[PDB]
Amino acid sequence: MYVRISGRIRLNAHITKTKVTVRTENGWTVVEVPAITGNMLKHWHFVGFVDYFKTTPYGVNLTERALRYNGTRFGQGETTATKANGATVQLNDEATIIKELADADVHGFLAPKTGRRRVSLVKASFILPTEDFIKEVEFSREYATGLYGFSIVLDLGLVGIPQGLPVKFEENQPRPNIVIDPNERKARIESALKALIPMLSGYVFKVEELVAIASEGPIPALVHGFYEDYIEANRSIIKNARALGFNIEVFTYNVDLGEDIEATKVSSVEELVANLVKM
């Protein structure tokens, strides 16, 4: 229900690149390095989510814009949105918006004219050349190909649930405030997991290694693949969180993690995804 993934990609002969400053343990040196916004990966998750959610019985619960992969959700002065239907949806009430529009549910929205906001359930940090790939430099050249760290977070437990009103009451008794039936909820979650395949495919990108983990509450967070450290760091986080009582499925792709985290080696992203869609 809650998924985090950290790992590394290799670039090749080719995407918005910008400059960031970063460190680089072994003393503290701040170094300006090229980087790629997480929105790259979020955009591609969003295309696949649409492509997978389309084909479900619910695929009509999408903004018309999402069907052309247009992610303007919403304009600064917009008060309505057109459903893939052609129906009009008021942007008044997060419950209504997310009930009708699964792209706003899963990928969030902004409606400043009505004062409504939903943080995206799909998050992606900056993609950054590795602490250890820097250091080997001791320069573009190498950065244009090169080894980049990433990190992704999927808070899928909040699908169908407004963030400004997660629970409703009476008789003085809190209930989760879920505004879509259980099957649409499920279709939306599977689609948000299967969308991981094109989010990570390429289509500039080979996935070299990653660590992924389960649910069912913000669990713990992972260390970003940037750190030379990160695999050992994630080992510690995981065996500590397990020791404390958190229940956590772990999956790995070309990484060891070690002796002995109960883990599950996969041979590909597809296989990871396949494992996740376990519901």
Side-chain angles (χ1 to χ4, degrees), residues 1-130 132-279:
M1 290 222 117
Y2 295 66
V3 173
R4 304 169 175 270
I5 307 161
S6 185
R8 290 169 170 206
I9 65 177
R10 191 98 220 188
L11 277 202
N12 58 92
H14 300 262
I15 279 201
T16 297
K17 314 177 169 176
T18 52
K19 277 178 176 179
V20 209
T21 48
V22 122
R23 43 281 130 189
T24 67
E25 309 161 279
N26 190 347
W28 290 359
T29 15
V30 166
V31 51
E32 215 170 32
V33 299
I36 304 162
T37 177
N39 276 310
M40 163 151 84
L41 296 168
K42 191 188 180 284
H43 186 249
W44 290 111
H45 178 274
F46 167 69
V47 170
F49 169 78
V50 174
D51 286 339
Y52 284 106
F53 187 73
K54 263 198 293 213
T55 63
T56 73
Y58 306 97
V60 127
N61 298 333
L62 284 182
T63 67
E64 184 197 340
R65 292 177 181 157
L67 291 193
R68 1 150 190 149
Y69 313 112
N70 179 313
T72 310
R73 198 190 318 111
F74 307 91
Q76 240 152 243
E78 284 174 351
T79 243
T80 59
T82 299
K83 194 179 182 171
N85 273 22
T88 310
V89 182
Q90 301 294 318
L91 299 184
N92 277 348
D93 150 80
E94 181 186 10
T96 305
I97 294 169
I98 68 181
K99 183 212 262 191
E100 304 288 345
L101 311 170
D103 48 315
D105 179 5
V106 171
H107 275 266
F109 65 89
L110 244 107
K113 184 61 173 301
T114 63
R116 302 307 177 181
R117 345 176 20 266
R118 177 172 176 87
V119 170
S120 196
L121 309 187
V122 179
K123 311 179 190 192
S125 290
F126 273 76
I127 303 173
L128 302 163
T130 277
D132 45 288
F133 177 90
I134 316 164
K135 276 159 118 98
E136 304 182 54
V137 309
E138 285 156 350
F139 266 133
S140 3
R141 29 155 103 233
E142 331 219 51
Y143 287 133
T145 29
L147 187 61
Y148 284 77
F150 72 92
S151 172
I152 292 168
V153 178
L154 299 181
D155 300 309
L156 293 181
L158 277 138
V159 159
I161 296 174
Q163 295 167 3
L165 200 71
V167 345
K168 294 216 273 202
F169 289 94
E170 208 149 54
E171 282 236 71
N172 218 334
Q173 237 90 17
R175 330 179 309 169
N177 186 14
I178 311 189
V179 309
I180 52 170
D181 77 20
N183 302 280
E184 172 163 27
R185 187 158 199 272
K186 183 156 167 259
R188 286 183 187 198
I189 291 174
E190 304 212 353
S191 292
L193 293 164
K194 290 176 191 153
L196 284 171
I197 289 154
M199 183 185 198
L200 287 178
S201 71
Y203 226 164
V204 196
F205 259 51
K206 203 146 48 62
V207 168
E208 302 292 348
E209 54 183 74
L210 53 79
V211 180
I213 58 165
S215 85
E216 220 118 297
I219 245 39
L222 299 183
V223 169
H224 197 295
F226 167 77
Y227 293 98
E228 59 194 338
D229 232 19
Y230 88 105
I231 288 157
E232 180 62 14
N234 286 319
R235 170 205 162 68
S236 305
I237 283 160
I238 289 162
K239 76 183 289 169
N240 272 8
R242 269 173 173 164
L244 284 168
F246 301 92
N247 195 47
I248 297 167
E249 285 227 71
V250 177
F251 307 82
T252 50
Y253 174 68
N254 302 336
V255 296
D256 193 352
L257 221 56
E259 327 247 3
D260 218 83
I261 304 212
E262 180 211 353
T264 293
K265 317 256 184 186
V266 295
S267 35
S268 77
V269 176
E270 291 73 354
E271 206 209 319
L272 166 58
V273 166
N275 271 301
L276 299 165
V277 322
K278 83 218 171 172
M279 179 175 191

